[PDB]
Amino acid sequence: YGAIYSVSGPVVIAENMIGCAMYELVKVGHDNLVGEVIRIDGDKATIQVYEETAGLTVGDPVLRTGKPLSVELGPGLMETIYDGIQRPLKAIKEESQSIYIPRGIDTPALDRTIKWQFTPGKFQVGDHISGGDIYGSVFENSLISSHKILLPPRSRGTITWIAPAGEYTLDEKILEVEFDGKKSDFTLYHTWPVRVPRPVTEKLSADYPLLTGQRVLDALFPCVQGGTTCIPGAFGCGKTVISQSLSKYSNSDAIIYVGCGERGNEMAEVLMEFPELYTEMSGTKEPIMKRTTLVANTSNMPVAAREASIYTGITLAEYFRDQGKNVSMIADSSSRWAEALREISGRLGEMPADQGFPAYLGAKLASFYERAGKAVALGSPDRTGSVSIVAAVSPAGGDFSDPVTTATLGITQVFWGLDKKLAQRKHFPSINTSVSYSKYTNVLNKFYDSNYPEFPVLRDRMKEILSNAEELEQVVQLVGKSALSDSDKITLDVATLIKEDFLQQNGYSTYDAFCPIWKTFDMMRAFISYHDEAQKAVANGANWSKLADSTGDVKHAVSSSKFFEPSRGEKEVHGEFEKLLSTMQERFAES
Amino acid sequence: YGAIYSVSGPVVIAENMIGCAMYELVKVGHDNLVGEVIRIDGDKATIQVYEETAGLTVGDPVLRTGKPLSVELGPGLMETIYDGIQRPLKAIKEESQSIYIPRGIDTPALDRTIKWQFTPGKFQVGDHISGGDIYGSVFENSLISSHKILLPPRSRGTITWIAPAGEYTLDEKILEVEFDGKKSDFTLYHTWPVRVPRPVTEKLSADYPLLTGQRVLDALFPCVQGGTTCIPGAFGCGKTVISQSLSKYSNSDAIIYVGCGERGNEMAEVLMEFPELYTEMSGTKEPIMKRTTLVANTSNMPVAAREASIYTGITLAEYFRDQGKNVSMIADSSSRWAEALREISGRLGEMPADQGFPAYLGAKLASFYERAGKAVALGSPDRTGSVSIVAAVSPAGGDFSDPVTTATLGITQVFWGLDKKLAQRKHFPSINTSVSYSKYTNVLNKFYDSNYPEFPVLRDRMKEILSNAEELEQVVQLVGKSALSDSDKITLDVATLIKEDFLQQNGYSTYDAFCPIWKTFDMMRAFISYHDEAQKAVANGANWSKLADSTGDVKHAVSSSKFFEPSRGEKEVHGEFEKLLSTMQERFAE
Amino acid sequence: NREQVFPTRMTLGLMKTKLKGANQGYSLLKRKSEALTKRFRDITKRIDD
Amino acid sequence: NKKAVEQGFNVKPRLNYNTVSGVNGPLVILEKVKFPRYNEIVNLTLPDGTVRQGQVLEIRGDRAIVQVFEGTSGIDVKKTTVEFTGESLRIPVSEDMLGRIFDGSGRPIDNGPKVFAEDYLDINGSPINPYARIYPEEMISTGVSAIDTMNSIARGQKIPIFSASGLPHNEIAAQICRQAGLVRPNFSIVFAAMGVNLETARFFKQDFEENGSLERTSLFLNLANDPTIERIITPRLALTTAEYLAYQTERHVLTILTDMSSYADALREVSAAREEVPGRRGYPGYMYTDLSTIYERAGRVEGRNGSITQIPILTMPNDDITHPIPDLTGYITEGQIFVDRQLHNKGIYPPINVLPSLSRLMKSAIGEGMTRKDHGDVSNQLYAKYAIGKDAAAMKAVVGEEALSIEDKLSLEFLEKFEKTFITQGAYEDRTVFESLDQAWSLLRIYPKEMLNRISPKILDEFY
Amino acid sequence: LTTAEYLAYQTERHVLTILTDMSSYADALREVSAAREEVPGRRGYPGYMYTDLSTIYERAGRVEGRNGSITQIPILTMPNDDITHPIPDLTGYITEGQIFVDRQLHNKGIYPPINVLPSLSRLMKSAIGEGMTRKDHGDVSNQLYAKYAIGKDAAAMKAVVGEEALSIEDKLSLEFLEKFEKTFITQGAYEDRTVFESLDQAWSLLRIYPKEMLNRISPKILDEFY
Amino acid sequence: AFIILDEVIKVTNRRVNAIEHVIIPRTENTIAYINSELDELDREEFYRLKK
Ligand SMILES: Nc1ncnc2c1ncn2[C@@H]1O[C@H](COP(=O)(O)OP(=O)(O)O)[C@@H](O)[C@H]1O
Ligand SMILES: [Mg+2]
Structure with a gap:
C-alpha cells in the first residue's frame, strides 16, 4: 500500500x-x-x-x-455495454440508481447471478488439456449458442476433475487441472491481460471477404474477414455510420463495437437500434444485439481510459476469434485513442515527437492493428476465427497528413478515405474513390472466382470509368465540355450515373440499408452493360444527344436499380435485374 | 529595498x-x-x-x-507629451538639456511646480464621499476648463478637511478623508493601475454619433460616441487627415493620442503637426493641443513602454470620461503595439499561438476595446462620459493574415477602409466605400429618428446607388458603354456626381474643411432628390441625353452644395438648400 | 479547394512563384483579350459595311 | 425524504495558508500545504483585501499550484493569505436561478440576493452513463427553414452555430430561442456568455426580455472585460445549472454557449501559460477533452422527463471550418449550423450555408410519424440540387452561361430560388416544418420528376 | 548486416541485404531518443540519426582482398510520400541513389510504379555502358530522363494553360510519356527484361522523336542505333 | 478572319476566367495551407526546444 x-x-x-x-x-x-x-x-x-x-x-x-x-473473459459479455475498464454500464446504473458513472465503482465485469447451462466437451478426466482447448460449451443466447468455454492460455496439465452437465454460475468450479503436482481450479471465466495478445496456433492469410453491405465498400475497396481497415475523414464524413452499418449488416459472427472519444448519444443509438434489428444467421431472425458487445468510452469520460477501451475491445475480439467466430472489432476513433495517448504523454512531460503525439504512437498503433488477422485457435479442436479490425481514424481538420493517419495507413491494408466534399451534398458513403485503396483485391480473387467470377473485372471497369471521368472533369472545369468527343460524353454521363446511384448508398432507407453482394454485383453488371451499350451504339455512328434522349428510359431504369429491395430475396431480385438487362439491350437496339 | x-x-x-x-x-x-x-x-x-x-x-x-x-491622473495632463511609461518628453528634455532620455530619469509625470486654481465642490466637511465624486474643480485650459477633481475610485470615507478655494500644486494636500481612522489624504492628483479599467456605475449603450466632420465618415459609415472604429493606418492613405479631423473637428471634448511604436521620423511629424493645429471655438481660435495629450512612443523606446502605450492612453481616456467629458482615443499602430506585446511574450518565453503572437493577444485586444464605450461616471454628480477608440489596425493594412488585424476587425464595429489606390488617384479622404462598413447604424437609427429622420433612408439609398454603380461599371467594362439602359446610365452619372462632390472632401480647403451633420444631411437629401427626379424623368420616357442637357444647370447647382460654406450655419445654410432642392424639381419637371 | 502538395520551405517558394506566374499570365491574357476584342468590333463593323 | 441536506448542517473549518512559495503567470506555487486536494477551489486573499478564487491544478508533496481566475496581479508572498475550502468548485443551484443574471464566476450581477441554495453541485459534473442515455428522437421546429427542413434539431441535441466575427450568429440563435418548440406537442433557456462584448450581452438580455423568456432564463455573463481564466468555468457553471434544472427539476433547457471560440481562446491562453502540448494552432492537446466535457453534458436520460439542448455559438477565426475550434466542435457535437459570409454579403437572412451544416439527429426525428413522410428524401434531394447549383454557378463563372446543360441551367434557377426564397426568412417569421416542406416541394417541382433521383419512387409519386 | 558482412567478407559470397521499413527503424530510434530527453532533430528524430543511418547503410560494397560483395536495397516508407522528410532525406544523403516509387503511378495502375525523375543511381555512370552492358546505355538513359521530364512539364503546362502553349515537341513529349509509362515502365512481376531488351524497347520509345530532336544522344550512337 | 478571331477570343476569355477563378484561388489556398503547415511545424519545433 x-x-x-x-x-x-x-x-x-x-x-x-x-x-x-x-x-x-x-x-x-x-x-x-x-x-x-x-x-x-x-x-x-x-x-x-x-x-x-x-x-x-x-x-x-x-x-x-x-x-x-486484465479484461475478464467468459460467458456474459455478448449483449452488454462496457466502460473501457470493462465495467458493465447496465450493472453500474442498476447498482448506483443514478445517471452518472460513480468514481471507483467495482462492479464485476461479468454478471455472477446469472446461471449458465454448461455442457461438457470431448475432454474427460485424465486427458491432457492445454491452453485454448475447449473443455465445454455453454448456451449464452439464441444467436451466440454454444459459447465455447476455453481453457485459459498459458495453463496446461491433465484434467483431474471436470464438472458434469448442468447449470453453473461464473464463480462455480467447472474443471480442475493438475500440473507438476499443483492442482488448479478453473471456472467459466478467466482474465487475460489486454496488453499481451491472445496466442494462436498459426495466423492465416485471410481469404473470405467481410461483406460490409455498402456498395462502394463491397465492390471498389473490399475488406477480408481478418484484415485491418481504416476510415479517415473529417466530421460528418460518415465514418461512424459506416462503422455502424458494418456492425449491423456484415457477415461477422460477432461484433466488438468500441467507442473511444465518441458521443454517448451514438452508443445510446446503438443500444436503442440493435435490439430492434435482426440477422438471418443461425437459421432464425435473432436480434443483432445478441451478437455484439459494446465498449463505450464517451469523449468526456477519463482520458486515460481510451487506451483501456481499445485494448479491452481487441482482447474481446481475440477471445471470440479463439472460440472460432469471424469477429470484427470496430474502434470508433483510433484518432481519439492517439489524442488520449498524447494527453497522457504531455502530462508526463515526454518529448513531443510529431504534433505532440508521443514517439511510440506508431508502434502502439502497429501492435494494435497486428492483433487482427484470421488465425487457427491455440487449442484443439481445430477452428479458424478472425478479427477484422476496422478503426475509423478522425484526422484533425480533415487532412490525412496527421501522424495517426499516416501510421494507420502504414499498418492497415484497406484505406476507406472519406472526402468532406462528398460528405456535404449528402453523397454518402463519401468514400474518395481517388485516394481509397484495398490491398485485398488480389487475395479475394479466389472467392470471386468461386461465387461471382466477373466481379473483379467489373470493379476494374468501374475504376477505369471513374478515373477517366475524373481526368475529363479536371479538363472540363477549365476548358469547357464542348471539345469532348462522344465517348468522353458517355464516360462522364455514366460516371455521374455511377456516383449518383451505385456508389452513393443511403444508409437509412429501406432499400439501400443493406445492399448484399449479389445485388451489388447485379448493379455493377447493369451499370457496366449500360456504359458498354452506349459506347458501342455511339461507335456504330449514333449521335450521343439523340441516343440519350431516346434511351432515357433505360438510363432511369438503371438509376432506379437501388430501390430493388434485398428483402425480396436473391432469386426475386436477380430476376428483376435479369429483366433489366434484357430491357436494356432491346431499347438500345431499337434506337 | x-x-x-x-x-x-x-x-x-x-x-x-x-x-x-x-x-x-x-x-x-x-x-x-x-x-x-x-x-x-x-x-x-x-x-x-x-x-x-x-x-x-x-x-x-x-x-x-x-x-x-500606474498612471498620473490629475491637472497638468492636457498639453503634455508622454510615453508608454508616462514620462513627460518635454519636461525630460528641459531637465536633461539633451536630445536623449537618460536611463532612470525620474521627472514626475505631472508638473509639480505649477500652481493650479482650485474651487471646492458641493462636498462639505463631514459629508460622505465615495470613489469618483467630484469634490473640486481646477481651471486648467481654455478649451478644457473646470478640470473636475475626482476622488480615487477605490477611495471612500468621510471628509474631515477640505482645501479652501485658491491656488495649489499637486504635491500639497487638498482633501483629508477618514475611514475607520484617518488613513487617507488626497492631493490634486491620484494614480490608477494602468491595466485595471476605471470603474463606472453603469456602462450605457453608445447612441450619440461621433461627427468626425468628414462627409463620408459621418454619413455612410458613422461612429457612435463611445464606439470603437478601425482604420488601415498605412502610409500614403490619409490616416494623417483622419487624425487631424478627429483632433480638431470632432465632438470629443478631449483627445488622447498614442503612438505605441510608430517610427521616429513619424513621431516627429505628429509632434510637429498637432501643436500647429487650431480648433475654432465660441471664444476664439485656440490650439487643438489644448485638449489633446500625445503619448509619443517610437520604435527606439522600451518594448514595455510600447506595449503599455495604448493602455496608458485608454486609462487617460477613462479618467477624462470619469469627469463627464467625451474622449476620442486615436490609437495609431495597434499592430506595432501587438508587435511589442509579441516581443515581450517571446522574452518571457510563452508559447506562440498564431503567427508567433502570444496566446492572449485576442483577449488583451478584446479587453482593451471593451474598456471604451459610453458610461455614466462613478460617484455623484451623475455626469456621463464616453470613450471612443480609433485604432490604426496595421501597417499591414486590413490583411486578414495578421492575427492582430483579424482581431481588430472582429472586435471593432467600424472599419473606415482607406485605399492606397484612391490616395494615388487624388481621392480624398481616400475612403474605399466598397470595403468600409459600420455596424453602428442600427443604434444610430434612434438618434436619426430623433433629430434627422430621413438620414438612414438616404444613407441606404446612396449605398444602393454605389453598389449599382459598381455593377454598372463592371457591365460597361465587360461590354459596350452604350449597351447600358437609361436607368443604368442615370445611376452611373448620379454616382459619379456623388463621388466627385459629396464623397470627395477637400479638407485643406476652407469651405469643406468641416462639413457639419446638418450640412451633410442637406447635401445627401439634395443628391437623393436629384437622383429620384432623374429616375422619374427616365420613367416618363424622356431621352437621358436631352434630360442631362436640360438639367446641367441643376447638376451645377447641386455640385455647389459642397461650395456652400457652413460658416453661416443652421437655418442660414439650411434655407439655401431648400431653394436648391426646389430648383432640382422645377427645372427637372420642365 | 487547394493543390495536394506536400508542405515544404522550397515548395512554398515554388508555389508563390507559380502564383506570380499565374497572375502575370492572367493579366497578359486579359490584355490580349481586350486588344483582340477591339479588333473584333472593328471587324464586325467592317463585315456589316 | 431528502437525506442529502442532512449532511449540510456541518461546519468544516478551512486552513488559512500564508505560505505562498511563488507566483508565476496565472499560477501561484503554494508550499507547506496539509494534504492538498487535487481540485480544491481556494479563496485567495490579496494584501489589498481583495479576494480572488483559484483552484489547484497540480499538487506535489506539501505543495499546491493554484491558478486564480481573476489573475495574479498584486499577489504577494508576505501578505497573501490563501484559504483552502477543501472541496471542488460547487455552484449553489436552485429553481430560483431561472430569471436571474449571474457573472462569469456565478456571482449574481442582477442586483438581487445570493442564490438560496437548494443543492451544491460540482461545476465539472460527471459523465452521463451511456446506458442511461436516451437518443433524442423529438424534433424541434425552430421556425427556420434551413434548420428545420434541411437540418433538424432534436431535443437533446448538441447543435452549434458556426459563424464568423460579423455574421448574425447572435440574431439566429435569438430567433431559435424565441421560436423553439416541439414539432408535435416550454424551454427554460440557460445562457452562457464567454468573452462577448457588452453590445452582444445587452442584445441577448433585451431579446429575452422582449420575447418574454427572461422569466425562465439564467444568464451567465462573462463580458470581454471580465477575467479570461474564468471563461473556463463560466460554461461549466451554466451547464451545471442546466443539468440541475433539466435532470432534477424535470425541465427542458436550451443552453446557449456564446463564443465558444472565446472559451477555447481562454483555454489556449491557460495551456500556454503552463508548459503544455500545443495540439494544433497552439490550442491544448486536451482541447478535445475539455470541449467534450462541455458539449456532451447535453442530451436526455432514461427515467427523467428533462432534457438539455445546446446551441454553442462559435466564431470561426478566419471563416474556415478546418480551424481547431470548429473542427473539434464538429467532431464532438451532433451537428453544426453554418452561418455563411458568402450569403450574408449576398444579403440573405439567415445566412445559413446548408452544405457545411449538419444534424446527426435527423435520421431519428425524421420519419412518417415524427414529421411528414417525405422529409428525409426532400432534404437529401435539396442538398444534392443545391450542390449541383453551386457547381453550375462555378462552371458558369468559368465558361459562361451558354456552355451549361439543361440540368445545369435548371440547377442555377433552383439555386437562385432556393437562396432567395427557401433560406431567406424574416427575423421574426417562424415557418412550420410542413410549410417549409411545401416550399421545398415547390423548389423540387422546378425540376422534372425524372431528374429527382434522390426521392424514393413512392414519395415522388405521392408528393410530386 | 553483420550476418551479411560475415557471408560476404569471411565466406566470399555475394549478398543482397533487403532491410525493410527503415522508416520503422528510425521511428524506433525516435522513441528511444524521446525517452532520453535529448536535443531532437527535425520532426523529433535524434540529431545523430544521420550517424546511425550512415552506420547501417555504409555496410555495403566490395573490399580488395575479398571476392564477395554486399548489395544493399533498404526498403524505406516515406511517411507521407515526402522526400523532404528526415528519414528519406538523410537516407538520400548516405545511400548512393534511390528507387522512388510513386503513389501517382500506382494510382494510374503502373507496375512497377517507379518514378524515374526522383529515382537515381550514383553508380550508373560507372556500371553502365562502354562494353559493360552496351554502347548506348548511358546516352539512352539520359535521353529517356530528359524526354520524361519534358513530358511531365509539358503535361502540366497543357493542363494549366491549355494545349495551345504546348509546341510540336511538347505534344511529342506527351505522346512519349504516355507510351513510356504504359509500355516501358509498366512490367508485370515475374517478367525478366534483360538490359538489352529494355534498351531495345527504350530505343523503340525514342524513335517517336525525329533524329534531330533527340538531344542528349551522341551523334555516333544516334547514327548507329536510330 | 471574323470567325477565327471569334474562336481565339472565346478560348482566350475561357482561359482568363479559368485562371482567375480556379488557378489563382487554388494556388492562393495552397499557399495559405502550406504556410499554416510550416507554422505548425515551427510551433512543434519551438515546443520541443522549450522542453
Ligand atoms: N451512408 C449514409 N446514409 C445516410 N446518412 C448518412 C450516411 N453517412 C452519413 N450520413 C449522415 O451524416 C451524419 C453524420 O455522420 P457520422 O456517422 O456522424 O460521421 P462522423 O462520425 O464522421 O461525423 C449522420 O447523422 C447521417 O445522417
Ligand atoms: Mg463519429
Whole structure:
C-alpha cells in the first residue's frame, strides 16, 4: 500500500511504492480508482488513473494489485455495454440508481447471478488439456449458442476433475487441472491481460471477404474477414455510420463495437437500434444485439481510459476469434485513442515527437492493428476465427497528413478515405474513390472466382470509368465540355450515373440499408452493360444527344436499380435485374 | 529595498524581496531604473527592467514602489507629451538639456511646480464621499476648463478637511478623508493601475454619433460616441487627415493620442503637426493641443513602454470620461503595439499561438476595446462620459493574415477602409466605400429618428446607388458603354456626381474643411432628390441625353452644395438648400 | 479547394512563384483579350459595311 | 425524504495558508500545504483585501499550484493569505436561478440576493452513463427553414452555430430561442456568455426580455472585460445549472454557449501559460477533452422527463471550418449550423450555408410519424440540387452561361430560388416544418420528376 | 548486416541485404531518443540519426582482398510520400541513389510504379555502358530522363494553360510519356527484361522523336542505333 | 478572319476566367495551407526546444 505524492490531471505519482511493476494496476485513492503504472522513478510510480482524478489528496493510499490491466473473459459479455475498464454500464446504473458513472465503482465485469447451462466437451478426466482447448460449451443466447468455454492460455496439465452437465454460475468450479503436482481450479471465466495478445496456433492469410453491405465498400475497396481497415475523414464524413452499418449488416459472427472519444448519444443509438434489428444467421431472425458487445468510452469520460477501451475491445475480439467466430472489432476513433495517448504523454512531460503525439504512437498503433488477422485457435479442436479490425481514424481538420493517419495507413491494408466534399451534398458513403485503396483485391480473387467470377473485372471497369471521368472533369472545369468527343460524353454521363446511384448508398432507407453482394454485383453488371451499350451504339455512328434522349428510359431504369429491395430475396431480385438487362439491350437496339 | 541577484539581458532576479507583488514596478539599480516584477519565487523576484539593463551589478538596491504600472491622473495632463511609461518628453528634455532620455530619469509625470486654481465642490466637511465624486474643480485650459477633481475610485470615507478655494500644486494636500481612522489624504492628483479599467456605475449603450466632420465618415459609415472604429493606418492613405479631423473637428471634448511604436521620423511629424493645429471655438481660435495629450512612443523606446502605450492612453481616456467629458482615443499602430506585446511574450518565453503572437493577444485586444464605450461616471454628480477608440489596425493594412488585424476587425464595429489606390488617384479622404462598413447604424437609427429622420433612408439609398454603380461599371467594362439602359446610365452619372462632390472632401480647403451633420444631411437629401427626379424623368420616357442637357444647370447647382460654406450655419445654410432642392424639381419637371 | 502538395520551405517558394506566374499570365491574357476584342468590333463593323 | 441536506448542517473549518512559495503567470506555487486536494477551489486573499478564487491544478508533496481566475496581479508572498475550502468548485443551484443574471464566476450581477441554495453541485459534473442515455428522437421546429427542413434539431441535441466575427450568429440563435418548440406537442433557456462584448450581452438580455423568456432564463455573463481564466468555468457553471434544472427539476433547457471560440481562446491562453502540448494552432492537446466535457453534458436520460439542448455559438477565426475550434466542435457535437459570409454579403437572412451544416439527429426525428413522410428524401434531394447549383454557378463563372446543360441551367434557377426564397426568412417569421416542406416541394417541382433521383419512387409519386 | 558482412567478407559470397521499413527503424530510434530527453532533430528524430543511418547503410560494397560483395536495397516508407522528410532525406544523403516509387503511378495502375525523375543511381555512370552492358546505355538513359521530364512539364503546362502553349515537341513529349509509362515502365512481376531488351524497347520509345530532336544522344550512337 | 478571331477570343476569355477563378484561388489556398503547415511545424519545433 503506497501513498500518493503528486497529482496532475490523469497522472498520479505515488510515493512509498517500492515493488510496483510496469503497466501494473494500482487502486489509487480512497475510492480505489483503477490506474496503471507508466514509470518507476525509484520508489515513485507514475500512475495513469482510468477515472476522474479530481478530489485526490496527497497521502491517499494506492494498493498494488499485482496484475496488469486484465479484461475478464467468459460467458456474459455478448449483449452488454462496457466502460473501457470493462465495467458493465447496465450493472453500474442498476447498482448506483443514478445517471452518472460513480468514481471507483467495482462492479464485476461479468454478471455472477446469472446461471449458465454448461455442457461438457470431448475432454474427460485424465486427458491432457492445454491452453485454448475447449473443455465445454455453454448456451449464452439464441444467436451466440454454444459459447465455447476455453481453457485459459498459458495453463496446461491433465484434467483431474471436470464438472458434469448442468447449470453453473461464473464463480462455480467447472474443471480442475493438475500440473507438476499443483492442482488448479478453473471456472467459466478467466482474465487475460489486454496488453499481451491472445496466442494462436498459426495466423492465416485471410481469404473470405467481410461483406460490409455498402456498395462502394463491397465492390471498389473490399475488406477480408481478418484484415485491418481504416476510415479517415473529417466530421460528418460518415465514418461512424459506416462503422455502424458494418456492425449491423456484415457477415461477422460477432461484433466488438468500441467507442473511444465518441458521443454517448451514438452508443445510446446503438443500444436503442440493435435490439430492434435482426440477422438471418443461425437459421432464425435473432436480434443483432445478441451478437455484439459494446465498449463505450464517451469523449468526456477519463482520458486515460481510451487506451483501456481499445485494448479491452481487441482482447474481446481475440477471445471470440479463439472460440472460432469471424469477429470484427470496430474502434470508433483510433484518432481519439492517439489524442488520449498524447494527453497522457504531455502530462508526463515526454518529448513531443510529431504534433505532440508521443514517439511510440506508431508502434502502439502497429501492435494494435497486428492483433487482427484470421488465425487457427491455440487449442484443439481445430477452428479458424478472425478479427477484422476496422478503426475509423478522425484526422484533425480533415487532412490525412496527421501522424495517426499516416501510421494507420502504414499498418492497415484497406484505406476507406472519406472526402468532406462528398460528405456535404449528402453523397454518402463519401468514400474518395481517388485516394481509397484495398490491398485485398488480389487475395479475394479466389472467392470471386468461386461465387461471382466477373466481379473483379467489373470493379476494374468501374475504376477505369471513374478515373477517366475524373481526368475529363479536371479538363472540363477549365476548358469547357464542348471539345469532348462522344465517348468522353458517355464516360462522364455514366460516371455521374455511377456516383449518383451505385456508389452513393443511403444508409437509412429501406432499400439501400443493406445492399448484399449479389445485388451489388447485379448493379455493377447493369451499370457496366449500360456504359458498354452506349459506347458501342455511339461507335456504330449514333449521335450521343439523340441516343440519350431516346434511351432515357433505360438510363432511369438503371438509376432506379437501388430501390430493388434485398428483402425480396436473391432469386426475386436477380430476376428483376435479369429483366433489366434484357430491357436494356432491346431499347438500345431499337434506337 | 531588495538587492540584485542575477542579470541576464533585461530580465533581472532580485533577492531579498519579501513583500513584493506581481506586476509591481520596482526601482532597479543605483540609477533607479524602473521595471515590473514578472514572477516571484520566495525571496527572489524576477524583474523586466524597462530601460537598458547594462551596468547593473549584484547588490544594487531594488526599491519597491508598492503599486503596479500606474498612471498620473490629475491637472497638468492636457498639453503634455508622454510615453508608454508616462514620462513627460518635454519636461525630460528641459531637465536633461539633451536630445536623449537618460536611463532612470525620474521627472514626475505631472508638473509639480505649477500652481493650479482650485474651487471646492458641493462636498462639505463631514459629508460622505465615495470613489469618483467630484469634490473640486481646477481651471486648467481654455478649451478644457473646470478640470473636475475626482476622488480615487477605490477611495471612500468621510471628509474631515477640505482645501479652501485658491491656488495649489499637486504635491500639497487638498482633501483629508477618514475611514475607520484617518488613513487617507488626497492631493490634486491620484494614480490608477494602468491595466485595471476605471470603474463606472453603469456602462450605457453608445447612441450619440461621433461627427468626425468628414462627409463620408459621418454619413455612410458613422461612429457612435463611445464606439470603437478601425482604420488601415498605412502610409500614403490619409490616416494623417483622419487624425487631424478627429483632433480638431470632432465632438470629443478631449483627445488622447498614442503612438505605441510608430517610427521616429513619424513621431516627429505628429509632434510637429498637432501643436500647429487650431480648433475654432465660441471664444476664439485656440490650439487643438489644448485638449489633446500625445503619448509619443517610437520604435527606439522600451518594448514595455510600447506595449503599455495604448493602455496608458485608454486609462487617460477613462479618467477624462470619469469627469463627464467625451474622449476620442486615436490609437495609431495597434499592430506595432501587438508587435511589442509579441516581443515581450517571446522574452518571457510563452508559447506562440498564431503567427508567433502570444496566446492572449485576442483577449488583451478584446479587453482593451471593451474598456471604451459610453458610461455614466462613478460617484455623484451623475455626469456621463464616453470613450471612443480609433485604432490604426496595421501597417499591414486590413490583411486578414495578421492575427492582430483579424482581431481588430472582429472586435471593432467600424472599419473606415482607406485605399492606397484612391490616395494615388487624388481621392480624398481616400475612403474605399466598397470595403468600409459600420455596424453602428442600427443604434444610430434612434438618434436619426430623433433629430434627422430621413438620414438612414438616404444613407441606404446612396449605398444602393454605389453598389449599382459598381455593377454598372463592371457591365460597361465587360461590354459596350452604350449597351447600358437609361436607368443604368442615370445611376452611373448620379454616382459619379456623388463621388466627385459629396464623397470627395477637400479638407485643406476652407469651405469643406468641416462639413457639419446638418450640412451633410442637406447635401445627401439634395443628391437623393436629384437622383429620384432623374429616375422619374427616365420613367416618363424622356431621352437621358436631352434630360442631362436640360438639367446641367441643376447638376451645377447641386455640385455647389459642397461650395456652400457652413460658416453661416443652421437655418442660414439650411434655407439655401431648400431653394436648391426646389430648383432640382422645377427645372427637372420642365 | 487547394493543390495536394506536400508542405515544404522550397515548395512554398515554388508555389508563390507559380502564383506570380499565374497572375502575370492572367493579366497578359486579359490584355490580349481586350486588344483582340477591339479588333473584333472593328471587324464586325467592317463585315456589316 | 431528502437525506442529502442532512449532511449540510456541518461546519468544516478551512486552513488559512500564508505560505505562498511563488507566483508565476496565472499560477501561484503554494508550499507547506496539509494534504492538498487535487481540485480544491481556494479563496485567495490579496494584501489589498481583495479576494480572488483559484483552484489547484497540480499538487506535489506539501505543495499546491493554484491558478486564480481573476489573475495574479498584486499577489504577494508576505501578505497573501490563501484559504483552502477543501472541496471542488460547487455552484449553489436552485429553481430560483431561472430569471436571474449571474457573472462569469456565478456571482449574481442582477442586483438581487445570493442564490438560496437548494443543492451544491460540482461545476465539472460527471459523465452521463451511456446506458442511461436516451437518443433524442423529438424534433424541434425552430421556425427556420434551413434548420428545420434541411437540418433538424432534436431535443437533446448538441447543435452549434458556426459563424464568423460579423455574421448574425447572435440574431439566429435569438430567433431559435424565441421560436423553439416541439414539432408535435416550454424551454427554460440557460445562457452562457464567454468573452462577448457588452453590445452582444445587452442584445441577448433585451431579446429575452422582449420575447418574454427572461422569466425562465439564467444568464451567465462573462463580458470581454471580465477575467479570461474564468471563461473556463463560466460554461461549466451554466451547464451545471442546466443539468440541475433539466435532470432534477424535470425541465427542458436550451443552453446557449456564446463564443465558444472565446472559451477555447481562454483555454489556449491557460495551456500556454503552463508548459503544455500545443495540439494544433497552439490550442491544448486536451482541447478535445475539455470541449467534450462541455458539449456532451447535453442530451436526455432514461427515467427523467428533462432534457438539455445546446446551441454553442462559435466564431470561426478566419471563416474556415478546418480551424481547431470548429473542427473539434464538429467532431464532438451532433451537428453544426453554418452561418455563411458568402450569403450574408449576398444579403440573405439567415445566412445559413446548408452544405457545411449538419444534424446527426435527423435520421431519428425524421420519419412518417415524427414529421411528414417525405422529409428525409426532400432534404437529401435539396442538398444534392443545391450542390449541383453551386457547381453550375462555378462552371458558369468559368465558361459562361451558354456552355451549361439543361440540368445545369435548371440547377442555377433552383439555386437562385432556393437562396432567395427557401433560406431567406424574416427575423421574426417562424415557418412550420410542413410549410417549409411545401416550399421545398415547390423548389423540387422546378425540376422534372425524372431528374429527382434522390426521392424514393413512392414519395415522388405521392408528393410530386 | 553483420550476418551479411560475415557471408560476404569471411565466406566470399555475394549478398543482397533487403532491410525493410527503415522508416520503422528510425521511428524506433525516435522513441528511444524521446525517452532520453535529448536535443531532437527535425520532426523529433535524434540529431545523430544521420550517424546511425550512415552506420547501417555504409555496410555495403566490395573490399580488395575479398571476392564477395554486399548489395544493399533498404526498403524505406516515406511517411507521407515526402522526400523532404528526415528519414528519406538523410537516407538520400548516405545511400548512393534511390528507387522512388510513386503513389501517382500506382494510382494510374503502373507496375512497377517507379518514378524515374526522383529515382537515381550514383553508380550508373560507372556500371553502365562502354562494353559493360552496351554502347548506348548511358546516352539512352539520359535521353529517356530528359524526354520524361519534358513530358511531365509539358503535361502540366497543357493542363494549366491549355494545349495551345504546348509546341510540336511538347505534344511529342506527351505522346512519349504516355507510351513510356504504359509500355516501358509498366512490367508485370515475374517478367525478366534483360538490359538489352529494355534498351531495345527504350530505343523503340525514342524513335517517336525525329533524329534531330533527340538531344542528349551522341551523334555516333544516334547514327548507329536510330 | 471574323470567325477565327471569334474562336481565339472565346478560348482566350475561357482561359482568363479559368485562371482567375480556379488557378489563382487554388494556388492562393495552397499557399495559405502550406504556410499554416510550416507554422505548425515551427510551433512543434519551438515546443520541443522549450522542453
Ligand atoms: N451512408 C449514409 N446514409 C445516410 N446518412 C448518412 C450516411 N453517412 C452519413 N450520413 C449522415 O451524416 C451524419 C453524420 O455522420 P457520422 O456517422 O456522424 O460521421 P462522423 O462520425 O464522421 O461525423 C449522420 O447523422 C447521417 O445522417
Ligand atoms: Mg463519429
